[PDB]
Ligand binder design. Structure first.
Ligand SMILES: O=C[C@H](O)COP(=O)(O)O
Ligand SMILES: O=C[C@H](O)COP(=O)(O)O
Ligand SMILES: O=C[C@H](O)COP(=O)(O)O
Ligand SMILES: O=C[C@H](O)COP(=O)(O)O
Lengths: 349, 349, 349, 349
């Protein structure tokens, strides 16, 4: 009767093979999909003018790092970069392919307030998405990313039912559209750290959100075997004076996932959401000392892979090698953390 | 806590006043929002080439009909027409204002298949909708329309849960966005007549769909006082050899509405969905002999107001007067039907 | 396919005829279904020992009041009373029939905390309900009542999603079971007045609860034509120093109903929930000066019909006539209030 | 705000420890909770009169089998048996304790048709359940069982939305009540094999049902760490002429679980639902050659553990030893199957 028509075996096999390649042991994702405006903030941190040439130089600096593919399975790109050439004229996608890094593409169109909420956000982008996915696949992308955002505010009842319902609906539609176009969807429901709530509050909210997200994925006929999750870790709020221990973050994060995520999903690729480079590595490492797990626990890091790379680049060209060196140090740290083998650098029901 | 923030009293009052003006006794809506392609079919029925000049001539023929505002409270426009001038150079909106007809604007971006359904449709258009609503309000629109489509197929389980969920979600988001921009949303969940199902099947499906739609409107903080519903009448499927009597259509249609539609909604403006001009009038008339009702039962007709107008125009200019004459005959028929006073032309639980 | 099987036309007609008889103009319900324990509190207010003989005397005092049927369409009984005889040996149901008052029966089994909520309540009683309904119908009952309870506490997020979901589920199951056994279900989702919240908070919560209740009634195939609603009025919380004006209570109460209740429902029979006898009458009267309405707005009062009757009885037999006199005064007041004709005694979006 | 209050750490630890003991490697559950009537059918198969003495003899035959605890971690009892003594006067629970088998208790009150469905069933029993759980815990029970039933009928749209919603609601309420009383809930949503549908239809329906069940468990604050699932295997319908291969049943069953069941659940204890003793063992064995899994895959078998035991007993006393011998043969077979080590006896997206 009215059940989902069967997905194409050929398409399903491609999605599942690529999702498992992205969630490969000892590897994770480099998130380099900062929009034209978000990257301005980054370039401002080191005093660089946001010219197309500078963005091309920096993304070339990242993707032409020799040996990066030992630790990086995929790279999320902004649309500009997907169709960009390096200063030397090499397509960015060809830099990735030479390292065997799978290109991915951010496909949402950003955030808009839900009417009559206290500044809670819907993620836009479904219009034309299917046609965009087709073009992006032809350009070399094999996975996609769509970011939704929720916030915790006990006094205001955030996240409200409408926020959660909207986030889940947008992610499920986006995920099904991606899979119909041969792109592995990264499902990113980010619960922001804003506030002074405890780690146990983050855990409760994360559980409620993921339960809703995965029910909606099921309702929309999303193939978990060919999808990835990119959630927040479970942590104290950012206004808390003391950060939770790495063991605490690891425990509550794994618990929240095991309570809500069906194990057909091949990989959970965490966002770093403002954490320091070293915390992001140590928190992931601590989770993978608790393994083996029913899914790969790994990373999809932007700031946590690039912070020191930017401060070492400083917009100054000649120290490109130094900047690439520190990117490799962080890629190695997080690849080792995926295995629970990172040596440091720099049950509750 | 996490309830809807209060709507602006000033905005709410405008929406409610305009919704009641649109649902005025003895009046209804002229649906003239045929897209550039849908109008080609119409012009083909009488052998007219779909030039911008011909579309402008025909829409001018409609909106410059003297005295049309006695029976027509509002006119739904396609975007082209909202910003168009008549052949004589008068803005289409000024033609409407001269008759005191409120301009309205279709804001959805059409239909797209839901992945892994049997050709069941999502309605697209939320991206940029809020900004479009602002521009359309400045151009003179005071209400909007968004068409969703469902079909009945018992053997295939249509409409499936995913279809209904998607339709309701899109309509609720669209309605809340419209109201945040001072536009009265017409909520159109059209259940197609395709198939050979009985009128009682149409009634069951219509009830399930409207129950879902109105729950979602509530979830999204939509102000029913400043909204309108544009549903199918409840009828036999179009493949049935005998059409249901007008009394039967009237009974099951009113029953389906009274079982699902809260009476804060000011107006139900039916689509004609393929009915003949005379059936559309007689079916509405029969419902309003059953009055008084908790909401206005009226019309938002395209074909049922224009069919004979087109065949009388034939693309030939000079018989503009004849064509306008027959438009007035149908506008009067349906205005009188709104009052249950149309004289004809041409309990089950 | 998987839609509700059609209700029996014969059963549906009986339910709809009896629901409309209960919601008759100028009449309402006497709620006399105080359990054996709840009545102890009442008898304690005037110093009477809760013997079966005293309960029989008092219920006989109520139901043998000459002319009560001019204002009382139905009487809700506790099970004991349904099978009880007056001190003179006349069955209580025969007293009701002699006045043409329809007997009704409370069928829930009281409240139990939902695990891991802050003392939020499920209503129990579905087990054996269908068989109880059959016996109660044979004993003369023609409608039933099932009380659910919610509370407002913004700091604790009450009513929580689980509370609302449970209330709606229990009411919908109970209502469908009643109708399968030829009993009109009174659907009572009582939002308690406890707290210091504003009337606008009560309105928001009442809207959310009723939207959920009526969606669940639809999901469970409940025939609205053969059902009744018994909601709280919309008021300030009981800890507020100033009580809302009668005009304010009337406005927000009617608005909350018209925003959520489909007009196929024949009647809304308010609970008085702690209001004084005179407030209960004046608040209902004010709503029916705002008529005519899409459904009957009337009363299902316990305390608001009996408070002075008890204090006049005092457990002293001989002043049975005085007590019956004051019951008639309150029955007349509320019957007149149903018509908006009570002369007193003793738009916001 | 309105989230679940924290479960008691002491209660949670007990539930999780007992759930893991029940789901112990190489062991599973003996389902001996046949009601007084269901056992009549069994005794009739071999011509035994359903006297309390015969039931006591047979349950004693089962539970006094020497060495049974090597393969049986728990035994589900009917209430009669929980408070029964063997013919020799030993309490049934003491027989279990002597083998280290954990006693469990069936707590539902059977099935009742949902009004206006085509004979789809609600499970009754929530009324008084919490108090029953307390008494059963004092009598020695440490886990409970509640059976819901769904059927597949594509032409009738079964299982309908109402069936699934009801099943999920009843299971979630029951599970939360059990855990509040220190009993591990076995969650049994049995999809019947009735019909001629393919194994892929069973897989689709099983996925939809389990997705709904686990969302409802989350909504009701059920601790997955202290719960167990008892689902149907995924198989062809019982009217199909050819039974699916053991490899096919194993593949689709594991897939349906991994697509819907969060891995915090410690154990999935399959019902045998009419399968032969040898099929039940071989199908489980085939699943555990596919291990290791994110949860224990094991058995909760009635017929598949007792069929030959009954036919060997024949109601004749003296061959008690023979009957116990064959029970041990089947207990060993299924314990070995839990490990994927049973030697036989007697990717699709
Ligand atoms: O974490 C996800 C990405 O950083 C979001 O990028 P964006 O802010 O440009 O949408
Ligand atoms: O009934 C609604 C309108 O006729 C839909 O117009 P459209 O086909 O151009 O979207
Ligand atoms: O308002 C409803 C009834 O007064 C409830 O009676 P009860 O407390 O005995 O359940
Ligand atoms: O599979 C579960 C049990 O066999 C059900 O026992 P029952 O039929 O007595 O409820």
């Amino acid at each position: 009767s009215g059940y989902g028509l069967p997905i194409s075996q050929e398409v399903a096999k491609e999605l599942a093979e690529n999702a498992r390649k992205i969630a490969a042991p000892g590897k994770g994702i480099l998130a380099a999909d900062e929009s034209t405006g978000t990257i301005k903030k980054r370039f401002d941190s080191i005093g660089v003018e946001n010219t197309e040439a500078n963005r091309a130089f920096y993304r070339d600096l990242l993707f032409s790092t020799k040996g990066l593919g030992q630790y990086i399975s995929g790279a999320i790109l902004f649309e500009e970069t997907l169709y960009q050439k390096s200063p030397s004229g090499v397509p960015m996608v060809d830099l990735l392919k030479a390292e065997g890094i799978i290109p991915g593409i951010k496909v949402d169109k950003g955030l808009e307030t839900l009417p009559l909420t206290d500044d809670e956000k819907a993620t836009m982008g479904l219009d034309g998405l299917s046609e965009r996915c087709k073009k992006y696949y032809e350009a070399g992308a094999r996975f996609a990313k769509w970011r939704a955002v929720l916030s915790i505010d006990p006094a205001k009842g955030k996240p409200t039912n409408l926020s959660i319902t909207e986030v889940a609906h947008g992610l499920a539609r986006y995920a099904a559209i991606c899979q119909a176009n041969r792109l592995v969807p990264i499902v990113e429901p980010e619960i922001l750290t804003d506030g002074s709530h405890d780690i146990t509050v983050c855990a409760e909210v994360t559980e409620r959100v993921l339960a809703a997200v995965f029910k909606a994925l099921n309702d929309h006929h999303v193939l978990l075997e060919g999808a990835l999750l990119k959630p927040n870790m479970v942590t104290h709020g950012s206004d808390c004076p003391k950060p939770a221990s790495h063991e605490e973050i690891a425990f509550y994060t794994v618990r929240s996932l095991k309570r809500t995520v069906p194990p057909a999903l091949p990989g959970v690729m965490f966002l770093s959401g403002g954490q320091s480079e070293e915390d992001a590595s140590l928190n992931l490492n601590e989770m993978n000392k608790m393994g083996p797990h029913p899914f790969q626990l790994s990373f999809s890091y932007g700031r946590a892979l690039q912070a020191s790379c930017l401060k070492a680049w400083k917009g100054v060209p000649e120290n490109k090698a130094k900047a690439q060196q520190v990117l490799m140090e962080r890629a190695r740290a997080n690849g080792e953390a995926q295995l629970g083998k990172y040596g440091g650098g720099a049950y509750v029901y």
